[PDB]
């Protein structure tokens, strides 16, 4: 049915910074509403969100982070182009809006203005057809509940501990249903908190609702994590029942100087810290041998493609190698990562590319080529749960959407529970654990 | 129109523990859906949520915290009783479900099963009437956007720091609109986070999205707060433009031992383990604690103090309200637990001039509205409050506007479990701006204060 | 839904004088109709109704009391401003209409033109939503049936008896339901009439359907009233079951010469009559000691604020002190009465302020400050029963709407019976008698 | 469309006594609601309302006047019989309810229960057809706005004055429109009230909103009336512009003793208690009373006299109609009590040329329409009448227009129980002005008068 009304407003995201919400109405009574997550404002590689810097709105909010200009672009520019088009024509609307902005990185109107409309339009159509969004996006056959990557331990520049790696995650593999996998994650998370309190660590949380306790090294954190998995009644590893694996996001661009990798906080604490690409690759195989790490993200720097290609060739048959800063959901960079065998997996961030149709094009390219497409959250989030319906719609098999606290993450797990409930009555719900890694030629026993 | 379907499910709250969501459908096409916040499981005074302890469900989630029994109670017991009733009859529905449970503290079916149905019914009726929830709850005339009590600094039992008081809050008073007041709180919050980092304090957050840095005393925390307000461009105080006040939740039941109040984290930091407090430096009887509050009130722009004395120390409250109740808000939380009979006692004894309102502590929407109305009729403010375990549900935003509470307490400025409520207030403000008027009146919401003074004035 | 039609006509009120009726229709089929009661045509303090004086309509009706000009203002000026607005936006419509008139006392278009539209709009919205008006006005929670103040005995300038006080009322307190309270009032009223006939007094009625028999003094009237309450089977007093209290409207502005109060008819009959403020205050305490008078209205003159303040301070803890001529439902005067502790209660007359939203603002201000808001009728009335729904919507706890004869009063009691019936099935109906006086610090036993 | 719900309740009438209101709903969304006026409880001739005497309800209201039994009879007996019938079948419904009661005077269920349903059914059918009630009752052609008989001066049993006749009325004849005639009555009424005050008379009102001042005789009252008409700017008379006539309800059954008519209030004012009326100064046989009427008719512009003779004095009526029936209206009220069989007798004996019509004296709408039609076919006028106990119900306004009665009797110009009917006539006049034509024909409504004369003419 025809779109009758498009309206945007400025609200706050989960970090206390402005973001944009878009409502869409249709003649037949459909209503769709979406909230854009936080993204990049500068960069030459990703779609660019538009903030209120150097406008009459700049002083509204701290750091000039308002998005009223994007709101004005939706309400004044995008809306009259879109009103009167059939809402079920997602690809036409997305293409309409891309051309209206006319720049490749969506810098003129704002990636946040464009994505907000793109997603609200799709939700309005799904609402009108009285279909869950994952059915509208995916057709009749989606059944695959994704394995979650749950943040638990955090490092990097902004964390006061001595972990130079960015984040550590658990992945609940050996379970028959999504509900049981989430229950296991709930047990590991709360037992993890209990152990951290028992050893005198802090249990406050960061932007993803995980912990950043004062660990002295990667090895200590990995040791602590293995123990918490065992305390909860599960088995650290890949195969078998109750298996729970670990995944790491190294964010290696952050500790690369163009020639060497430096564990800067570890080095400062001691007052091996330096690695060339081959030595860093060696450290990983040490960790991969000792601990049950199924997946490493941004193991090397965005400018160290040779490190990536050698990483993928040495461990990519048996471990997931994820690009994030390497690829920024850029289809052209993805084609090069495919052609050069640099990774076997990619993070998908809707607001890094700017529309739903482009995101689906990028997901399909990654999967056609034998990689997994891990649907990812952002730092600044909301109760919008699009990415839960997206992960089921495209059979991603994997989602990355935070630890087990804060509604900005929890809502996505709740949405997966509601989707699982819907598939249990009116279809079939599938949770296949370790089998989601179709990109790994062989998956071996960790022991 | 008639209720056709009531369905409940188990989901997770913002602390990662199970809670309950209820959906209600009406024959006219209305849909309403509510998520119950975390509450008390034991206690002799408030409505009791039901967890899965000693059931076939106990092993589902950590700590035996599932709520499948309450889900079954909605789906198997409450729903057949409620289907077929007109959804607009809120008081009838709530009365029927209260009688169906039959216990005064809602223990049999669970206060969480009962509140979930109570709220989803109301939202479905509003949805079918194409009215915002606050217009359904409140009639034609509500226009009052509430002043937020924004958590920023946390202390008390579980914080590693040396603050014995449980939380410190800012209240943006001297602003023309709710949007501008929220912009001011945004500026104080991020400037506070920058100042904290600048001094080497931690900037992770707790349950309500505020900070628990390693402060050494109440005074150190309060000094830091005052400077953050100034650094943001505002004036710490009560009256005038750009005024930003402070509120405190002492939660004094937690450091009362039966006879004296003991600043036990502060004392464990000075005294070694073999030492007694021979000088009574960290101990206070009621009057001595009242003297300490008076000192803080004179030096710092503290407009409101919650649970200044213990739940069993009614005398301490009565003396507190006697000495500073004309010029300062005195809130009962643990003292009153949203209990109508205890509020009548507090009104009769003149113990407080304000009360926190927690939907799930009383257990239905109609009883909550009875309790709010009794508080306001008696000249008290009713502060609509969040819980520690929360969701994207924003009922309390609409409730605060519907009853013209004038004040809401729903957390710091991070985490969607708090942010969604401020966002709902922004949407309500936008609705009132085009179809009515939105009023933000700042310090004028303290109608319970006989004489609000200038803070900078020498008292 | 959108207002499609607004139409006004001139009809007659209950005194045989013109008044205005307004109909409102909406696109969805809602219909609302309201009749304005009679109000002031001159005065510098209240909203001013517009009569046909010095127009081509002046000779239509006796005393030039037509309201065709107001009817023309609704049909020609107000209606085209309002048509096409959503009827559920009461505050917007009221604010629209205030600005359209543009004068503070609504003198240009007429308070009667403005109130007629304001009320008909609200009834149309309530009708459209298939909600009783008190639910539309008040939300989900209203349950409080008000205690009625029933006129029974009348004095003042226009009454040929020797009562200088304006009116005497009964208030049925000690009863469990509104129905029973009204039944008690019906018994006192008819027994009162029987006793008056037995003693040779006249039983014809005035504008409020009460009596004005040839009593010689206030004391004789109060004696007669106490006896009738006893004859009917009830107890004169405040507390206990079957308690029925008395309330007085002195209308003291009428017998004040700027320096003294003169009981003029009592003085003329004798051919104590003169009182300064302190002596008048003394007379009241005499009556308050002898008879069960719970409430005195306009005990002192509108220009004698010092008399009011001393009245409230000497008996206001235990008796209701009502302003009427003192405050004329004027929010700014009300603020001064609150600030100066002159009264603990105020009459609310919708057509003295001019719109429903302003009336609700005034009610809310009075209640927030610890006063009771007594919803009042006017002398010239109709079968419109708005004030019954208003008293329940705002939990006034008290209504003042006439004696127990004439449909211009009876309709309001019937509407309370229909509201009580609605609350009995679909909610709860509450009648709390003596507890409505939350403004009285202590309520003592009259004996 | 089909009736889906019939519900009755007890409310109060304009004298503060219980009466009954009935609501009727139809499947198509029609709603109709009627309020029954006060009637007779005992009597051998008219339909009988049922009060709560000797029931569990007797103590509810003063005088045992409740009507809950009739309410129960609607809700428990009549409603199940009527639900499912098409609402447009007025005659069917009325026939079914008459048979359901089974007694000729409607004593078993109550004439008030029966009439309430009868009228609410008709109003619901009109409401569902989006027709004003008078178009539903009357067809396409009604246009005749009735001349009002406006009570102004009251006497008889309960008035303290010395008038033995029960009421005096004005009728505004010489005017072009109903609005103008009502404006004239408004002017006479308020000028009459001013003149009364000017002479020290009382100005409170009785049941019908007219005056009962302390007049000494019929002549004094009639003189006052004539001067008020002149003071208002009109001409007391029958013909020509601005004519205002007078009508009288003698209610002569009240001062007939069986043999003679006795002006008993007039006599109690002249004669002391020990005195007989040796001269027969205040007594009248039939012929002597007819001579007295003739005297008043010659001096005063009296166009109509109601109940000039007693209910049992059929001969007095027959002689009255013989002597002055060509030139004056002769109304039966107590004589006929809206009884079809008694009207046939009055027609056959030529006792009257006009009859009052009281819905609740016969008990259904179809029987009322039968009675009106029989009266008009026989050359009589049918004057649609109010009762002493009334409400804002305005059925009789629509009824008077629907049947082209030409005359209505519904009280003075104060009290909503009377004013609402004039207001309904103003709304009907407005409807006819835009969608048809409104006719006010003044003196021409007396089609029952063989020769209406000029009053000022010497007869």
Numbering used by the authors:
A (entry chain B), C (entry chain B): 2 to 272, 282 to 457
B (entry chain A), D (entry chain A): 2 to 460
Task: Cite, word for word, the article reporting this structure.
Enolase (EC 4.2.1.11) is a conserved metalloenzyme present in almost all organisms of the phylogenetic tree that plays a role as a phosphopyruvate hydratase in the reversible chemical reaction of 2-phosphoglycerate (2-PG) to phosphoenolpyruvate (PEP) in the glycolysis pathway. Surface enolase is recognized as a plasminogen receptor in several pathogens and is thought to be involved in extracellular matrix degradation and host cell invasion. The assembly of monomer enolase varies among species and is present either as a dimer or octamer but seldom both. Among them, Mycoplasma hyopneumoniae (M. hyopneumoniae, Mhp) is the causative agent of enzootic pneumonia (EP), which is a chronic respiratory disease in pigs and causes significant economic loss in pig production globally.
However, the structure of the enolase of Mycoplasma, which is found in an independent evolutionary branch of bacteria, remains unknown. Here, we reported the first three-dimensional (3D) structure of Mycoplasma enolase (Mhp Eno, short for Mycoplasma hyopneumoniae Enolase). The structure showed a unique Mycoplasma enolase with characteristic long loops in the S3/H1, H6/S6, H7/H8, and H13 regions. As a virulence factor candidate found in our previous studies, Mhp Eno showed a surface localization on M. hyopneumoniae cells as determined by flow cytometry and electron microscopy. Mhp Eno specifically adhered to STECs and recognized the host plasminogen. All of these results show the unique features of Mhp Eno.
